[PDB]
């Protein structure tokens, strides 16, 4: 509901220097936080009109204020601009603004407690002087402190501005400084020579140009952002990211402020700090694209950037990454192999165990991982072995040299760890041997039960072999009498004379010289 003459008016927004104090961004203020004094003025009204009106409105003499229209430039900045108050004073408000509606103007005034003390709006020769803005960067707090503005002749040399900078910043005089120009977002160029004049020092010298300076100090290197150049590259690339714990359901998460240019290490460090913990103790997850939730694990050595990780979020969603806190160190967690096998205890019973040696490890390592975990029996050896079983037969015993990479548990029950009995520890090598024993009953492919290694002795006779089997095999004499005992090789078997046959060691050795092929074995014929 505009009404008749609304089109002859324009909004003029006046901003006072106190609005610049506290700003951490580029230029002088954040457009979304700035507080304006607003005027509704005739477009065709004059400059002297607005100036006088403003003087009386604001409680300052007209002689004592200066107007610097705010100018939005193609280089990505909005800066205060020069206005000759007299020369242009009879041009119109809409003219002077180049049809910007609203029009923002920086209004310079005097303190005025300093104005009670006599001070005045300074000399400004629009041809030979320049107004500069001064910002001090403190690397310890990583912040910008607004140091106000100066007037200086153009021909004055940078070195001559150092004491004013030191003063406005609370620095003891003759403190060495690094000066930068803030040209635009993501461009802050160090001023290399202090002994040249302002036209040479600054890129393209204008009123409203910004100088950012800092103490030149070795403690600056302790900061995450040691120079203003770095500080501004950081702020230019800042992005807020919600992190959620994957393990904890439904968790809303916490917001962390990061930079798109950060690598794995940097991100880890920041998130690890907000959780009070080692970054090496975290694992992170990529994104699933359009679905919310955790994607694939992010390797500790990831080469990309946070921008690469965040690239799949659409224009407006919350950017969200999932992590998991780790009981252990991530380079170890990644290389950790989960080896599932059977522990066989002193009671001749099977427990399922999962051990985690290093995947580059060997059998000796897996064994001691298991020995750390279990109670051994009674008197016994305190020495362990690893058997490989397929179809309830032992296909072989494994030596500790063997790399773990040489095994593939095609089945969860393929591998068995067991404590070596005392009679078998160091066997008398000439007159006795170990044989694998398995249960079968119709055929020798008919295998079942728990298989085992048995010691047999040369010239020894079978009945006390049957007794040795007895003591271990848990059960009593009746259908242990069902048992008929065989010697098996490959295809076929034959059943030992249950008496009398006296053990001849190698009715059980393979063809002499042949190791690789599976040995003869002792079969047990019974059902279940």
């Amino acid at each position: 509901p505009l009404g008749s003459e609304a089109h002859l008016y324009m909004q003029v927004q006046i901003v006072a220097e106190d609005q610049f104090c506290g700003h951490q961004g580029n230029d002088m203020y954040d457009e979304e936080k700035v507080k304006y004094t607003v005027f509704k003025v005739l477009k065709n009204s004059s400059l002297a009109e607005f100036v006088q009106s403003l003087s009386q409105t604001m409680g300052f003499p007209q002689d004592q204020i200066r107007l610097w229209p705010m100018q939005a430039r193609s280089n990505g900045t909005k800066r205060p601009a020069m206005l000759d108050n007299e020369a242009d004073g009879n041009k119109t408000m809409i003219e002077l603004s180049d049809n910007e509606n609203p029009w923002t103007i920086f209004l310079e005034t005097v303190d005025p407690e300093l104005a009670a003390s006599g001070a005045t709006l300074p000399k400004f020769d629009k041809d030979h002087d320049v107004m500069l803005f001064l910002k001090m960067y403190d690397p310890k707090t990583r912040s910008l402190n607004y140091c106000g503005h100066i007037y200086t002749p153009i021909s004055c040399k940078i070195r001559d501005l150092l004491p004013v900078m030191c003063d406005r910043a609370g620095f003891i005089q003759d403190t060495s400084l690094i000066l930068y120009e803030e040209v635009k977002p993501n461009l802050t160029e160090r001023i290399q020579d202090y002994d040249v004049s302002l036209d040479k020092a600054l890129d393209e010298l204008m009123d409203g140009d910004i100088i950012v300076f800092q103490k030149d100090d070795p403690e600056n290197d302790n900061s995450e952002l040691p120079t203003a150049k770095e500080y501004f590259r950081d702020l230019y690339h800042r992005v807020d990211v919600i992190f959620c714990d994957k393990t904890i359901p439904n968790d809303p998460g916490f917001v962390v402020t990061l930079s798109n240019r950060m690598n794995y290490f940097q991100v880890a460090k920041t998130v690890a700090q907000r959780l009070n913990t080692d970054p090496m103790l975290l694992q992170f997850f990529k994104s699933q694209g359009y679905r919310d939730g955790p994607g694939n694990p992010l390797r500790h050595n990831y080469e990309g950037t946070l921008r690469d990780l965040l690239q799949f979020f659409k224009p407006r969603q919350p950017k969200k990454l999932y992590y998991q806190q780790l009981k252990m160190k991530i380079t170890d967690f990644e290389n950790r192999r989960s080896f599932k096998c059977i522990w066989l205890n002193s009671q001749f019973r099977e427990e399922e165990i999962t051990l985690y040696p290093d995947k580059h490890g060997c059998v000796r390592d897996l064994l001691e991982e298991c020995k750390k975990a279990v109670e051994l029996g009674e008197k016994a050896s305190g020495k362990l072995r690893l058997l490989e079983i397929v179809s309830y037969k032992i296909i072989g015993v494994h030596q500790e040299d063997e790399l773990l990479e040489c095994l593939s548990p095609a089945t969860s029950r393929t591998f068995r760890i067991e404590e070596i009995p005392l009679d078998q520890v160091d066997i008398d090598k000439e007159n006795e041997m170990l044989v694998t024993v398995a249960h079968f009953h119709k055929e020798v492919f008919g295998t079942f039960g728990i298989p085992f290694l048995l010691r047999i002795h040369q010239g020894e006779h079978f009945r006390e072999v049957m007794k040795r089997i007895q003591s271990l095999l848990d059960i009593q004499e009746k259908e242990f009498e069902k048992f008929k005992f065989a010697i098996v090789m490959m295809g076929r078997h034959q059943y030992i004379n249950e008496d009398e046959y006296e053990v001849n060691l190698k009715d059980f050795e393979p063809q002499p010289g042949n190791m690789s092929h599976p040995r003869p074995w002792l079969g047990l014929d019974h059902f279940n």
Partner: peptide
């Protein structure tokens, strides 16, 4: 003597 620039010519977008 030395003078200011009139307009900003570098680093446009």
């Amino acid at each position: 003597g030395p003078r200011k620039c009139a307009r900003k010519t570098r680093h446009a977008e």
